[PDB]
Amino acid sequence: SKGEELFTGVVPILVELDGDVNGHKFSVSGEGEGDATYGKLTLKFICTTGKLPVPWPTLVTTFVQCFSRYPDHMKRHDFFKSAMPEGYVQERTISFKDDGNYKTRAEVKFEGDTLVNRIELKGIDFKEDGNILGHKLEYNYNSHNVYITADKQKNGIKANFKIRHNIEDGSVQLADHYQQNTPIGDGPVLLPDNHYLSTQSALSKDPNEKRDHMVLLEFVTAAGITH
Ligand SMILES: [Mg+2]
Ligand SMILES: [Mg+2]
Protein backbone atom coordinates (compact mmCIF):
# COMPACT_ATOMS: atom_id res chain seq x y z
CA SER A 1 0.00 0.00 0.00
CA LYS A 2 0.94 3.67 -0.30
CA GLY A 3 1.39 4.41 3.38
CA GLU A 4 3.63 1.50 4.28
CA GLU A 5 6.03 2.41 1.44
CA LEU A 6 6.84 5.70 3.20
CA PHE A 7 8.53 3.73 5.99
CA THR A 8 10.86 1.32 4.16
CA GLY A 9 13.85 3.56 4.95
CA VAL A 10 15.09 5.86 7.72
CA VAL A 11 12.56 8.67 8.25
CA PRO A 12 13.34 11.91 10.15
CA ILE A 13 11.01 12.62 13.08
CA LEU A 14 9.98 15.88 14.77
CA VAL A 15 8.00 16.05 18.03
CA GLU A 16 6.45 19.24 19.43
CA LEU A 17 4.40 19.32 22.63
CA ASP A 18 2.71 22.10 24.55
CA GLY A 19 1.65 21.09 28.05
CA ASP A 20 -0.21 22.44 31.06
CA VAL A 21 -0.06 20.24 34.19
CA ASN A 22 -1.82 21.74 37.24
CA GLY A 23 -1.17 25.17 35.72
CA HIS A 24 2.55 24.54 35.06
CA LYS A 25 2.88 25.41 31.36
CA PHE A 26 5.78 23.98 29.37
CA SER A 27 6.90 23.05 25.87
CA VAL A 28 9.15 20.31 24.51
CA SER A 29 10.82 19.93 21.11
CA GLY A 30 12.22 16.62 19.91
CA GLU A 31 14.11 15.33 16.89
CA GLY A 32 15.34 11.99 15.69
CA GLU A 33 14.66 9.26 13.22
CA GLY A 34 12.79 6.00 12.85
CA ASP A 35 13.54 2.84 10.90
CA ALA A 36 10.30 0.81 10.96
CA THR A 37 12.03 -2.06 9.11
CA TYR A 38 13.64 -2.76 12.50
CA GLY A 39 10.92 -1.26 14.72
CA LYS A 40 13.55 1.29 15.78
CA LEU A 41 13.26 4.86 17.10
CA THR A 42 15.97 7.26 18.30
CA LEU A 43 14.75 10.60 19.72
CA LYS A 44 16.14 13.52 21.71
CA PHE A 45 13.78 15.90 23.53
CA ILE A 46 14.56 19.34 24.97
CA CYS A 47 12.37 21.34 27.36
CA THR A 48 12.37 24.75 25.69
CA THR A 49 10.62 26.57 28.54
CA GLY A 50 13.19 25.70 31.25
CA LYS A 51 12.90 22.80 33.67
CA LEU A 52 10.30 20.18 32.81
CA PRO A 53 7.68 20.36 35.62
CA VAL A 54 6.90 16.63 35.45
CA PRO A 55 9.30 13.67 35.25
CA TRP A 56 10.60 12.88 31.75
CA PRO A 57 9.47 9.23 31.85
CA THR A 58 5.83 10.28 32.28
CA LEU A 59 5.94 11.79 28.76
CA VAL A 60 7.58 8.93 26.85
CA THR A 61 4.35 7.42 25.52
CA THR A 62 2.98 10.81 24.51
CA PHE A 63 6.14 11.81 22.60
CA VAL A 64 4.85 7.59 16.66
CA GLN A 65 3.64 3.98 16.50
CA CYS A 66 3.84 4.10 12.69
CA PHE A 67 7.48 3.12 13.33
CA SER A 68 6.47 -0.24 14.86
CA ARG A 69 7.74 -3.25 12.95
CA TYR A 70 4.72 -5.13 11.62
CA PRO A 71 5.85 -8.59 10.48
CA ASP A 72 5.07 -9.20 6.82
CA HIS A 73 2.27 -11.64 7.74
CA MET A 74 0.73 -8.86 9.88
CA LYS A 75 0.95 -6.01 7.37
CA ARG A 76 -2.80 -5.92 6.86
CA HIS A 77 -3.19 -4.92 10.54
CA ASP A 78 -0.96 -1.82 10.44
CA PHE A 79 -3.40 1.04 10.88
CA PHE A 80 -0.69 3.57 11.72
CA LYS A 81 1.21 3.47 8.42
CA SER A 82 -1.99 3.02 6.39
CA ALA A 83 -3.17 6.49 7.47
CA MET A 84 -0.02 8.11 6.02
CA PRO A 85 0.87 10.57 4.67
CA GLU A 86 -2.28 12.45 5.73
CA GLY A 87 -1.88 11.01 9.21
CA TYR A 88 -3.97 10.34 12.27
CA VAL A 89 -5.24 11.93 15.45
CA GLN A 90 -4.02 10.11 18.56
CA GLU A 91 -5.82 10.84 21.81
CA ARG A 92 -5.10 9.41 25.27
CA THR A 93 -6.21 9.56 28.85
CA ILE A 94 -3.28 8.58 31.07
CA SER A 95 -4.48 7.94 34.64
CA PHE A 96 -1.77 7.96 37.30
CA LYS A 97 -3.02 5.70 40.09
CA ASP A 98 -3.80 7.70 43.26
CA ASP A 99 -2.76 10.88 41.43
CA GLY A 100 -3.72 13.08 38.47
CA ASN A 101 -4.32 12.40 34.81
CA TYR A 102 -3.02 13.58 31.46
CA LYS A 103 -5.30 14.09 28.49
CA THR A 104 -3.40 14.31 25.24
CA ARG A 105 -4.44 15.11 21.68
CA ALA A 106 -1.82 14.68 18.98
CA GLU A 107 -1.66 14.72 15.21
CA VAL A 108 0.89 12.47 13.54
CA LYS A 109 1.50 13.14 9.86
CA PHE A 110 4.12 13.87 7.24
CA GLU A 111 5.34 17.38 6.58
CA GLY A 112 7.29 16.80 3.40
CA ASP A 113 9.45 13.78 4.09
CA THR A 114 9.47 14.31 7.87
CA LEU A 115 7.13 12.45 10.23
CA VAL A 116 5.70 14.94 12.75
CA ASN A 117 3.97 14.41 16.09
CA ARG A 118 2.30 17.61 17.34
CA ILE A 119 0.80 17.25 20.84
CA GLU A 120 -1.32 19.25 23.27
CA LEU A 121 -1.20 17.82 26.79
CA LYS A 122 -3.41 18.80 29.74
CA GLY A 123 -2.79 17.41 33.22
CA ILE A 124 -5.12 17.96 36.17
CA ASP A 125 -5.76 16.61 39.69
CA PHE A 126 -2.09 16.02 40.51
CA LYS A 127 -0.98 15.98 44.13
CA GLU A 128 1.58 18.66 44.93
CA ASP A 129 3.94 16.14 46.56
CA GLY A 130 2.83 13.07 44.65
CA ASN A 131 5.22 11.06 42.51
CA ILE A 132 4.72 13.30 39.48
CA LEU A 133 4.83 16.89 40.79
CA GLY A 134 7.19 15.69 43.52
CA HIS A 135 9.66 14.25 40.96
CA LYS A 136 9.93 10.88 42.70
CA LEU A 137 10.22 8.72 39.57
CA GLU A 138 13.45 7.04 38.50
CA TYR A 139 14.89 8.06 35.14
CA ASN A 140 14.37 4.72 33.43
CA TYR A 141 11.70 2.78 31.60
CA ASN A 142 10.16 -0.68 31.52
CA SER A 143 8.92 -2.83 28.63
CA HIS A 144 5.17 -3.03 27.96
CA ASN A 145 2.60 -4.48 25.55
CA VAL A 146 0.16 -2.07 23.84
CA TYR A 147 -3.11 -3.93 23.20
CA ILE A 148 -4.78 -2.74 19.99
CA THR A 149 -8.37 -3.29 18.85
CA ALA A 150 -10.30 -1.91 15.89
CA ASP A 151 -12.68 1.07 16.28
CA LYS A 152 -14.74 0.75 13.10
CA GLN A 153 -17.23 3.56 13.82
CA LYS A 154 -14.32 6.01 13.88
CA ASN A 155 -12.45 4.33 10.98
CA GLY A 156 -9.58 3.79 13.42
CA ILE A 157 -8.26 1.93 16.45
CA LYS A 158 -8.25 1.93 20.22
CA ALA A 159 -5.62 0.66 22.61
CA ASN A 160 -5.30 -0.01 26.31
CA PHE A 161 -2.18 -0.69 28.35
CA LYS A 162 -0.56 -0.19 31.74
CA ILE A 163 2.72 1.63 32.04
CA ARG A 164 4.62 1.12 35.29
CA HIS A 165 6.99 3.90 36.33
CA ASN A 166 9.59 2.99 38.94
CA ILE A 167 9.49 5.18 42.05
CA GLU A 168 12.81 6.09 43.74
CA ASP A 169 11.84 4.10 46.84
CA GLY A 170 11.56 0.93 44.77
CA SER A 171 7.76 1.01 44.44
CA VAL A 172 5.84 1.52 41.18
CA GLN A 173 3.56 4.29 39.91
CA LEU A 174 0.94 2.84 37.57
CA ALA A 175 -0.12 4.95 34.58
CA ASP A 176 -3.18 3.41 32.94
CA HIS A 177 -3.35 4.31 29.24
CA TYR A 178 -6.52 4.50 27.15
CA GLN A 179 -5.94 5.47 23.52
CA GLN A 180 -7.96 6.29 20.37
CA ASN A 181 -6.66 6.89 16.84
CA THR A 182 -8.67 8.31 13.93
CA PRO A 183 -7.36 9.03 10.40
CA ILE A 184 -7.06 12.60 9.19
CA GLY A 185 -7.18 11.93 5.45
CA ASP A 186 -9.52 10.25 2.97
CA GLY A 187 -7.34 7.35 1.88
CA PRO A 188 -8.21 3.79 2.84
CA VAL A 189 -7.00 2.68 6.25
CA LEU A 190 -6.44 -0.78 7.71
CA LEU A 191 -8.74 -1.88 10.49
CA PRO A 192 -6.79 -4.52 12.42
CA ASP A 193 -7.54 -7.74 14.20
CA ASN A 194 -6.65 -7.73 17.90
CA HIS A 195 -2.89 -7.67 18.44
CA TYR A 196 -0.29 -5.89 20.53
CA LEU A 197 2.87 -3.80 20.16
CA SER A 198 5.73 -5.29 22.21
CA THR A 199 7.61 -2.15 23.23
CA GLN A 200 10.95 -1.61 24.98
CA SER A 201 12.47 1.77 25.76
CA ALA A 202 15.80 3.00 27.18
CA LEU A 203 16.34 6.51 28.52
CA SER A 204 19.69 8.27 28.63
CA LYS A 205 21.33 11.68 28.87
CA ASP A 206 23.51 13.47 26.35
CA PRO A 207 26.61 14.28 28.43
CA ASN A 208 27.15 17.53 26.48
CA GLU A 209 23.56 18.78 26.91
CA LYS A 210 22.92 21.24 29.74
CA ARG A 211 19.30 21.97 28.91
CA ASP A 212 16.72 19.71 30.53
CA HIS A 213 16.39 16.83 28.07
CA MET A 214 15.78 13.15 27.40
CA VAL A 215 17.33 10.72 24.90
CA LEU A 216 15.07 7.79 23.99
CA LEU A 217 15.98 4.55 22.15
CA GLU A 218 12.90 2.40 21.54
CA PHE A 219 12.12 -0.86 19.73
CA VAL A 220 8.58 -1.95 18.92
CA THR A 221 7.37 -5.14 17.25
CA ALA A 222 3.75 -5.99 16.50
CA ALA A 223 2.85 -9.41 17.82
CA GLY A 224 0.04 -11.68 18.92
CA ILE A 225 -0.92 -12.96 15.46
CA THR A 226 0.84 -16.04 14.10
CA HIS A 227 -0.31 -16.23 10.44
MG1 LIG B 1 9.74 -4.19 4.93
MG1 LIG C 1 12.59 -0.48 41.15
Numbering used by the authors: 2 to 64, 68 to 231
Task: Quote from the publication.
The chromophore of wild-type GFP in the ground state exhibits polymorphism in the chemical structure. The conformations of the residue at position 203 are gauche- for both. Gln222 in the T203V variant and Glu222 in wild-type GFP are in the same conformation as Gln222 in the T203V/E222Q variant. On the other hands, weaker hydrogen bonds longer that 3.0 Å were observed in the T203V variant and wild-type GFP as well as the T203V/E222Q variant at pH 5.0. The side chain conformations of the residues at position 203 in the A-variants T203V and T203I as well as in wild-type GFP are almost identical to those in the I stabilizing variants T203V/E222Q and T203I/E222Q. This indicates that the conformation at the position 203 is the same in the A and I states. In other words, structures spectroscopically suggested to be in the I state (T203V/E222Q and T203I/E222Q) is positioned in the low right area in the plot, while those to be in the A (T203V/E222Q at pH 5.0, T203V, T203I and wild-type GFP) and B (S65T and E222Q) states are in the middle-high right and low left areas, respectively.
Green fluorescent protein (GFP), discovered from Aequorea victoria, emits green light after absorption of blue light. GFP has a β-barrel fold, and the chromophore is formed at the center from the three amino acid residues Ser65, Tyr66 and Gly675,6. The protonation state of the chromophore differs between the two states, A and B. The phenolic group in the chromophore is protonated and neutral in the A state, while it is deprotonated and negatively charged in the B state. Spectroscopic measurements of the photoreaction of the A-type chromophore revealed the presence of the excited state proton transfer (ESPT) reaction, and a photoreaction model was proposed that includes the intermediate (I) state in addition to the A and B states.
